[model samples]
Target: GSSGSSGDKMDGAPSRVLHIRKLPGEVTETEVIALGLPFGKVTNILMLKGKNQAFLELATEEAAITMVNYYSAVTPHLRNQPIYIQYSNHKELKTSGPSSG
Candidate 1:
Protein backbone atom coordinates (compact mmCIF):
# COMPACT_ATOMS: atom_id res chain seq x y z
CA GLY A 1 0.00 0.00 0.00
CA SER A 2 1.27 3.48 -0.91
CA SER A 3 0.56 6.62 0.98
CA GLY A 4 -0.79 9.56 -1.00
CA SER A 5 1.98 11.65 0.45
CA SER A 6 4.61 9.35 -1.01
CA GLY A 7 2.88 9.35 -4.35
CA ASP A 8 2.87 13.13 -4.35
CA LYS A 9 6.60 13.23 -3.71
CA MET A 10 7.20 10.52 -6.30
CA ASP A 11 5.28 12.49 -8.89
CA GLY A 12 7.57 15.44 -8.37
CA ALA A 13 10.79 13.50 -8.92
CA PRO A 14 12.06 13.04 -12.47
CA SER A 15 13.92 9.77 -11.95
CA ARG A 16 12.71 7.10 -9.58
CA VAL A 17 14.52 3.94 -8.53
CA LEU A 18 13.08 1.04 -6.58
CA HIS A 19 14.59 -1.79 -4.62
CA ILE A 20 12.68 -5.07 -4.76
CA ARG A 21 13.23 -7.94 -2.42
CA LYS A 22 12.28 -11.57 -1.77
CA LEU A 23 12.62 -12.19 -5.46
CA PRO A 24 12.47 -15.72 -6.77
CA GLY A 25 16.00 -16.89 -7.39
CA GLU A 26 15.07 -17.84 -10.91
CA VAL A 27 13.64 -14.49 -11.86
CA THR A 28 15.76 -12.82 -14.49
CA GLU A 29 16.44 -9.21 -15.31
CA THR A 30 14.49 -9.58 -18.54
CA GLU A 31 11.38 -10.68 -16.65
CA VAL A 32 11.61 -7.62 -14.47
CA ILE A 33 12.00 -5.37 -17.50
CA ALA A 34 8.99 -6.94 -19.14
CA LEU A 35 6.90 -6.49 -16.03
CA GLY A 36 7.89 -2.82 -15.83
CA LEU A 37 7.81 -1.68 -19.45
CA PRO A 38 4.03 -1.49 -19.51
CA PHE A 39 4.05 1.06 -16.77
CA GLY A 40 6.98 3.05 -18.16
CA LYS A 41 10.42 2.82 -19.66
CA VAL A 42 12.73 0.71 -17.59
CA THR A 43 16.25 2.00 -17.38
CA ASN A 44 17.94 -0.99 -15.75
CA ILE A 45 17.47 -4.15 -13.72
CA LEU A 46 20.03 -5.79 -11.49
CA MET A 47 19.55 -9.11 -9.75
CA LEU A 48 21.94 -9.93 -6.95
CA LYS A 49 22.11 -13.38 -5.45
CA GLY A 50 24.32 -12.63 -2.49
CA LYS A 51 22.08 -9.84 -1.33
CA ASN A 52 18.90 -11.58 -2.41
CA GLN A 53 17.55 -8.42 -3.93
CA ALA A 54 16.80 -6.71 -7.21
CA PHE A 55 17.05 -3.11 -8.30
CA LEU A 56 14.79 -1.43 -10.82
CA GLU A 57 15.37 1.97 -12.34
CA LEU A 58 12.25 3.40 -13.89
CA ALA A 59 11.92 6.29 -16.30
CA THR A 60 9.77 8.27 -13.93
CA GLU A 61 8.49 8.35 -10.41
CA GLU A 62 4.91 7.80 -11.54
CA ALA A 63 5.79 4.48 -13.12
CA ALA A 64 7.59 3.39 -10.00
CA ILE A 65 4.53 4.20 -7.95
CA THR A 66 2.27 2.34 -10.33
CA MET A 67 4.40 -0.78 -10.20
CA VAL A 68 4.68 -0.60 -6.45
CA ASN A 69 1.00 -0.07 -5.89
CA TYR A 70 -0.31 -2.66 -8.32
CA TYR A 71 2.35 -5.34 -8.52
CA SER A 72 4.01 -5.34 -5.14
CA ALA A 73 1.66 -7.86 -3.67
CA VAL A 74 1.58 -10.17 -6.65
CA THR A 75 3.28 -13.39 -5.67
CA PRO A 76 6.06 -14.23 -8.04
CA HIS A 77 7.08 -17.58 -6.66
CA LEU A 78 10.52 -19.11 -6.77
CA ARG A 79 11.44 -22.42 -5.20
CA ASN A 80 7.99 -22.75 -3.65
CA GLN A 81 8.15 -19.38 -1.92
CA PRO A 82 6.46 -16.14 -2.82
CA ILE A 83 8.63 -13.15 -3.56
CA TYR A 84 8.17 -9.86 -1.78
CA ILE A 85 8.32 -6.46 -3.42
CA GLN A 86 8.74 -3.06 -1.87
CA TYR A 87 10.56 0.23 -2.22
CA SER A 88 14.07 -0.09 -0.84
CA ASN A 89 16.74 2.35 0.21
CA HIS A 90 19.61 0.02 -0.67
CA LYS A 91 21.92 1.38 -3.34
CA GLU A 92 24.35 -0.50 -5.55
CA LEU A 93 27.89 0.72 -5.77
CA LYS A 94 29.77 0.75 -9.00
CA THR A 95 33.41 -0.16 -9.10
CA SER A 96 35.44 2.92 -9.85
CA GLY A 97 38.71 3.02 -11.69
CA PRO A 98 41.74 4.15 -9.77
CA SER A 99 42.13 7.90 -9.78
CA SER A 100 44.37 9.09 -12.57
CA GLY A 101 47.76 10.18 -11.30
Candidate 2:
Protein backbone atom coordinates (compact mmCIF):
# COMPACT_ATOMS: atom_id res chain seq x y z
CA GLY A 1 0.00 0.00 0.00
CA SER A 2 2.81 2.41 -0.79
CA SER A 3 2.85 5.03 -3.51
CA GLY A 4 5.46 5.99 -6.08
CA SER A 5 8.83 7.48 -5.33
CA SER A 6 12.15 7.14 -7.07
CA GLY A 7 12.21 3.38 -6.88
CA ASP A 8 15.93 3.43 -7.31
CA LYS A 9 16.35 4.82 -3.81
CA MET A 10 13.15 6.53 -2.69
CA ASP A 11 13.75 4.94 0.66
CA GLY A 12 17.46 5.11 0.05
CA ALA A 13 20.02 2.47 1.00
CA PRO A 14 20.51 2.26 4.73
CA SER A 15 23.74 4.13 5.33
CA ARG A 16 25.02 2.61 8.56
CA VAL A 17 22.15 0.95 10.39
CA LEU A 18 21.11 -2.64 10.13
CA HIS A 19 17.77 -4.04 11.25
CA ILE A 20 17.87 -7.39 12.97
CA ARG A 21 14.82 -9.55 13.57
CA LYS A 22 13.52 -13.00 14.52
CA LEU A 23 15.37 -13.04 17.79
CA PRO A 24 14.30 -15.63 20.29
CA GLY A 25 12.48 -14.26 23.30
CA GLU A 26 15.31 -15.34 25.55
CA VAL A 27 18.07 -13.82 23.50
CA THR A 28 20.33 -11.70 25.66
CA GLU A 29 22.48 -8.60 25.14
CA THR A 30 25.66 -10.63 25.04
CA GLU A 31 24.13 -12.92 22.47
CA VAL A 32 23.34 -9.99 20.25
CA ILE A 33 26.83 -8.66 20.65
CA ALA A 34 28.38 -12.01 19.84
CA LEU A 35 26.50 -12.04 16.58
CA GLY A 36 27.74 -8.68 15.37
CA LEU A 37 30.87 -7.83 17.28
CA PRO A 38 33.38 -9.57 15.07
CA PHE A 39 32.58 -7.70 11.88
CA GLY A 40 33.05 -4.18 13.19
CA LYS A 41 32.23 -1.77 15.94
CA VAL A 42 28.62 -1.17 16.79
CA THR A 43 27.99 2.49 17.40
CA ASN A 44 24.53 1.89 18.83
CA ILE A 45 22.01 -0.83 19.62
CA LEU A 46 18.33 -0.92 20.51
CA MET A 47 16.96 -4.11 21.94
CA LEU A 48 13.23 -4.34 21.39
CA LYS A 49 12.56 -7.55 23.27
CA GLY A 50 8.84 -7.05 22.94
CA LYS A 51 9.30 -7.07 19.17
CA ASN A 52 11.89 -9.81 19.11
CA GLN A 53 14.06 -7.50 17.05
CA ALA A 54 17.00 -5.16 17.38
CA PHE A 55 18.62 -2.33 15.47
CA LEU A 56 22.35 -1.82 15.26
CA GLU A 57 24.33 1.18 14.10
CA LEU A 58 27.73 0.13 12.87
CA ALA A 59 30.74 2.40 12.92
CA THR A 60 30.47 2.98 9.18
CA GLU A 61 28.40 2.17 6.16
CA GLU A 62 31.19 -0.02 4.88
CA ALA A 63 30.91 -2.08 8.02
CA ALA A 64 27.23 -2.59 7.51
CA ILE A 65 27.84 -3.61 3.93
CA THR A 66 30.40 -6.15 5.01
CA MET A 67 28.20 -7.65 7.71
CA VAL A 68 25.23 -7.93 5.40
CA ASN A 69 27.27 -9.94 2.96
CA TYR A 70 28.60 -12.26 5.61
CA TYR A 71 25.29 -12.71 7.35
CA SER A 72 23.51 -13.35 4.11
CA ALA A 73 25.89 -16.08 3.21
CA VAL A 74 25.81 -17.83 6.54
CA THR A 75 22.28 -16.92 7.70
CA PRO A 76 23.37 -16.92 11.29
CA HIS A 77 21.17 -17.99 14.14
CA LEU A 78 20.61 -17.20 17.79
CA ARG A 79 20.07 -20.17 20.12
CA ASN A 80 19.62 -22.19 16.97
CA GLN A 81 16.75 -19.96 15.89
CA PRO A 82 17.28 -18.37 12.53
CA ILE A 83 17.50 -14.58 12.58
CA TYR A 84 16.84 -12.14 9.81
CA ILE A 85 18.98 -9.20 8.86
CA GLN A 86 18.43 -6.34 6.47
CA TYR A 87 18.99 -2.67 5.80
CA SER A 88 17.12 -0.43 8.15
CA ASN A 89 15.21 2.65 7.08
CA HIS A 90 17.48 4.68 9.26
CA LYS A 91 21.06 5.74 8.81
CA GLU A 92 21.74 5.94 12.53
CA LEU A 93 20.48 4.48 15.76
CA LYS A 94 19.79 7.61 17.72
CA THR A 95 16.80 9.10 19.52
CA SER A 96 16.55 12.00 17.07
CA GLY A 97 16.55 9.95 13.88
CA PRO A 98 13.63 7.95 12.52
CA SER A 99 13.17 4.43 13.87
CA SER A 100 14.79 1.49 12.18
CA GLY A 101 12.52 -1.13 10.67
Candidate 3:
Protein backbone atom coordinates (compact mmCIF):
# COMPACT_ATOMS: atom_id res chain seq x y z
CA GLY A 1 0.00 0.00 0.00
CA SER A 2 1.08 3.61 -0.63
CA SER A 3 0.32 6.98 0.90
CA GLY A 4 0.67 10.45 -0.66
CA SER A 5 1.74 13.76 0.76
CA SER A 6 -0.52 16.78 0.91
CA GLY A 7 2.35 19.18 0.59
CA ASP A 8 1.64 22.83 1.31
CA LYS A 9 0.68 25.42 -1.28
CA MET A 10 0.06 29.02 -0.38
CA ASP A 11 -2.87 30.95 -1.74
CA GLY A 12 -2.24 32.38 -5.25
CA ALA A 13 0.49 29.84 -5.67
CA PRO A 14 0.60 26.96 -8.13
CA SER A 15 -1.61 24.28 -6.76
CA ARG A 16 -1.49 22.90 -10.25
CA VAL A 17 -2.32 19.37 -9.28
CA LEU A 18 -5.32 17.20 -8.45
CA HIS A 19 -5.86 14.31 -6.12
CA ILE A 20 -7.98 11.86 -8.11
CA ARG A 21 -9.64 9.16 -6.05
CA LYS A 22 -12.21 6.39 -6.26
CA LEU A 23 -10.70 5.48 -9.61
CA PRO A 24 -11.81 2.30 -11.28
CA GLY A 25 -9.38 -0.46 -11.99
CA GLU A 26 -10.07 0.00 -15.67
CA VAL A 27 -9.19 3.67 -15.85
CA THR A 28 -6.04 4.20 -17.88
CA GLU A 29 -3.48 6.99 -17.66
CA THR A 30 -4.61 8.21 -21.08
CA GLU A 31 -8.23 8.48 -19.97
CA VAL A 32 -7.25 10.51 -16.95
CA ILE A 33 -5.26 12.78 -19.22
CA ALA A 34 -8.21 13.01 -21.56
CA LEU A 35 -9.87 14.90 -18.69
CA GLY A 36 -7.38 17.77 -18.67
CA LEU A 37 -4.91 17.37 -21.51
CA PRO A 38 -7.18 19.44 -23.72
CA PHE A 39 -7.07 22.25 -21.23
CA GLY A 40 -3.26 22.38 -21.13
CA LYS A 41 -0.09 20.45 -20.75
CA VAL A 42 0.06 17.73 -18.11
CA THR A 43 3.13 17.77 -15.98
CA ASN A 44 2.64 14.28 -14.62
CA ILE A 45 0.22 11.44 -13.84
CA LEU A 46 0.95 9.24 -10.85
CA MET A 47 -0.75 5.88 -10.35
CA LEU A 48 -1.10 4.50 -6.87
CA LYS A 49 -3.42 1.55 -7.19
CA GLY A 50 -1.42 1.11 -4.18
CA LYS A 51 -4.96 2.16 -3.04
CA ASN A 52 -7.07 2.92 -6.12
CA GLN A 53 -5.88 6.53 -6.04
CA ALA A 54 -3.84 8.64 -8.46
CA PHE A 55 -2.59 12.15 -9.03
CA LEU A 56 -2.74 14.41 -12.10
CA GLU A 57 -0.40 17.31 -12.40
CA LEU A 58 -0.92 20.28 -14.74
CA ALA A 59 1.63 22.61 -16.18
CA THR A 60 0.48 25.72 -14.38
CA GLU A 61 -1.79 27.01 -11.64
CA GLU A 62 -4.23 28.50 -14.08
CA ALA A 63 -4.71 25.23 -15.91
CA ALA A 64 -5.56 23.46 -12.67
CA ILE A 65 -7.92 26.23 -11.61
CA THR A 66 -9.90 25.93 -14.84
CA MET A 67 -10.12 22.16 -14.55
CA VAL A 68 -11.35 22.26 -10.97
CA ASN A 69 -14.04 24.76 -11.87
CA TYR A 70 -15.42 22.71 -14.75
CA TYR A 71 -15.33 19.18 -13.32
CA SER A 72 -16.23 19.92 -9.71
CA ALA A 73 -19.57 21.40 -10.78
CA VAL A 74 -20.65 18.94 -13.45
CA THR A 75 -18.92 15.86 -12.13
CA PRO A 76 -17.17 13.58 -14.66
CA HIS A 77 -17.30 9.89 -15.45
CA LEU A 78 -15.55 7.61 -17.87
CA ARG A 79 -17.45 4.64 -19.34
CA ASN A 80 -19.60 4.94 -16.23
CA GLN A 81 -16.50 4.84 -14.08
CA PRO A 82 -16.91 7.13 -11.09
CA ILE A 83 -14.23 9.46 -9.78
CA TYR A 84 -13.63 12.26 -7.31
CA ILE A 85 -11.49 15.30 -7.96
CA GLN A 86 -10.01 17.98 -5.78
CA TYR A 87 -7.00 20.26 -5.88
CA SER A 88 -3.93 18.58 -4.50
CA ASN A 89 -2.44 20.23 -1.44
CA HIS A 90 0.98 20.18 -3.03
CA LYS A 91 1.68 23.16 -5.27
CA GLU A 92 3.88 20.82 -7.26
CA LEU A 93 4.01 17.03 -7.27
CA LYS A 94 7.52 16.12 -6.30
CA THR A 95 9.14 12.99 -7.71
CA SER A 96 12.15 10.99 -6.73
CA GLY A 97 14.79 10.91 -9.40
CA PRO A 98 15.54 7.81 -11.47
CA SER A 99 14.34 4.77 -9.61
CA SER A 100 16.75 2.09 -8.51
CA GLY A 101 15.07 -0.18 -11.06
Candidate 4:
Protein backbone atom coordinates (compact mmCIF):
# COMPACT_ATOMS: atom_id res chain seq x y z
CA GLY A 1 0.00 0.00 0.00
CA SER A 2 1.31 3.44 -0.95
CA SER A 3 0.16 7.03 -0.63
CA GLY A 4 -2.57 7.37 -3.29
CA SER A 5 -5.16 9.88 -2.26
CA SER A 6 -5.62 12.55 -4.82
CA GLY A 7 -8.89 14.44 -5.12
CA ASP A 8 -10.83 15.14 -8.32
CA LYS A 9 -8.81 13.09 -10.78
CA MET A 10 -8.74 14.54 -14.29
CA ASP A 11 -7.77 13.12 -17.66
CA GLY A 12 -4.66 15.23 -18.14
CA ALA A 13 -2.26 17.11 -15.88
CA PRO A 14 -3.40 20.42 -14.43
CA SER A 15 -2.72 23.19 -16.93
CA ARG A 16 -3.62 26.83 -17.27
CA VAL A 17 -5.19 25.98 -20.62
CA LEU A 18 -8.42 24.07 -20.99
CA HIS A 19 -9.57 22.12 -24.06
CA ILE A 20 -13.26 22.73 -24.64
CA ARG A 21 -15.32 20.83 -27.18
CA LYS A 22 -18.88 20.38 -28.41
CA LEU A 23 -19.00 24.06 -29.17
CA PRO A 24 -21.88 25.63 -30.98
CA GLY A 25 -21.20 26.13 -34.68
CA GLU A 26 -22.24 29.78 -34.58
CA VAL A 27 -20.28 30.50 -31.40
CA THR A 28 -17.90 33.45 -31.26
CA GLU A 29 -14.72 34.22 -29.33
CA THR A 30 -16.63 36.43 -26.94
CA GLU A 31 -18.93 33.56 -26.11
CA VAL A 32 -16.00 31.19 -25.63
CA ILE A 33 -14.06 33.46 -23.33
CA ALA A 34 -17.13 33.90 -21.16
CA LEU A 35 -16.69 30.35 -19.93
CA GLY A 36 -13.50 31.20 -18.06
CA LEU A 37 -14.32 34.80 -17.37
CA PRO A 38 -15.99 33.99 -14.05
CA PHE A 39 -13.02 32.02 -12.74
CA GLY A 40 -10.21 34.32 -13.91
CA LYS A 41 -8.75 36.32 -16.73
CA VAL A 42 -8.64 34.63 -20.12
CA THR A 43 -5.12 35.11 -21.43
CA ASN A 44 -5.46 33.31 -24.77
CA ILE A 45 -7.95 31.48 -26.93
CA LEU A 46 -8.02 29.20 -29.99
CA MET A 47 -11.18 28.28 -31.84
CA LEU A 48 -11.57 25.21 -34.09
CA LYS A 49 -14.67 25.65 -36.16
CA GLY A 50 -14.11 22.47 -38.09
CA LYS A 51 -13.89 20.26 -35.01
CA ASN A 52 -16.45 22.26 -33.05
CA GLN A 53 -13.89 22.72 -30.33
CA ALA A 54 -11.74 25.42 -28.70
CA PHE A 55 -9.00 26.12 -26.15
CA LEU A 56 -9.04 28.64 -23.33
CA GLU A 57 -6.03 29.71 -21.28
CA LEU A 58 -6.56 31.16 -17.83
CA ALA A 59 -4.40 33.48 -15.76
CA THR A 60 -3.33 30.62 -13.47
CA GLU A 61 -3.63 26.92 -12.81
CA GLU A 62 -5.92 27.50 -9.84
CA ALA A 63 -8.38 29.39 -11.99
CA ALA A 64 -8.40 26.66 -14.61
CA ILE A 65 -9.02 24.00 -12.00
CA THR A 66 -11.90 25.94 -10.54
CA MET A 67 -13.57 26.40 -13.92
CA VAL A 68 -13.27 22.70 -14.66
CA ASN A 69 -14.69 21.72 -11.32
CA TYR A 70 -17.59 24.12 -11.61
CA TYR A 71 -18.44 23.01 -15.14
CA SER A 72 -18.09 19.38 -14.14
CA ALA A 73 -20.93 19.80 -11.70
CA VAL A 74 -22.96 22.19 -13.85
CA THR A 75 -22.82 21.23 -17.51
CA PRO A 76 -21.32 24.15 -19.41
CA HIS A 77 -23.99 25.58 -21.67
CA LEU A 78 -23.42 28.18 -24.36
CA ARG A 79 -25.89 29.54 -26.81
CA ASN A 80 -28.58 27.58 -25.02
CA GLN A 81 -26.63 24.36 -25.63
CA PRO A 82 -24.31 22.11 -23.67
CA ILE A 83 -20.52 22.16 -24.11
CA TYR A 84 -17.54 20.14 -22.88
CA ILE A 85 -14.61 21.26 -20.75
CA GLN A 86 -11.29 19.69 -19.84
CA TYR A 87 -7.65 20.49 -19.08
CA SER A 88 -5.43 21.07 -22.12
CA ASN A 89 -2.20 19.17 -22.59
CA HIS A 90 -0.39 22.40 -23.32
CA LYS A 91 0.74 24.72 -20.55
CA GLU A 92 0.01 27.75 -22.71
CA LEU A 93 -1.16 28.73 -26.17
CA LYS A 94 1.02 30.19 -28.95
CA THR A 95 -0.53 31.94 -31.93
CA SER A 96 0.91 32.78 -35.32
CA GLY A 97 0.93 36.01 -37.32
CA PRO A 98 1.99 39.46 -36.23
CA SER A 99 0.55 41.15 -33.19
CA SER A 100 0.49 44.67 -34.58
CA GLY A 101 -0.47 46.09 -37.94
**Highest lDDT among the candidates is held by which one?**
4
Whole-model lDDT values for every prediction: 0.67, 0.76, 0.78, 0.80
Better by TM-score, candidate 2 or 1: 2
User: RMSD to native for every prediction?
Assistant: 5.4, 7.7, 7.8, 6.7
lDDT for model 1 comes to 0.67
TM-score of each: 0.61, 0.76, 0.76, 0.77
Backbone clash total for model 1 is 0
**Candidate 4: residue pairs that collide:** none
lDDT of 2: 0.76
Using lDDT, rank the candidates from best to worst.
4, 3, 2, 1
Candidate with the greatest TM-score versus the true structure: 4
TM-score of model 1 relative to the true fold? Answer: 0.61
lDDT, candidate 1, 1-101, per-residue tens:
65433333353333367777777676777777776788889866778887678878777677877787785445465557766666655443232456885
Candidates 1 and 4: which is better by lDDT? 4
Model 2: lowest-lDDT 10 consecutive positions: 3-12
Residue-level lDDT tens digits of model 3 in 22-78: 887867888888887877888788988667789888887788888887874576877
lDDT at position 81, candidate 1: 70
Residue-level lDDT of model 2, residues 1-101, one tens digit each, is: 54443424344464688888898887777777777788888778889868788887777888888888786557677776889888887655756644685
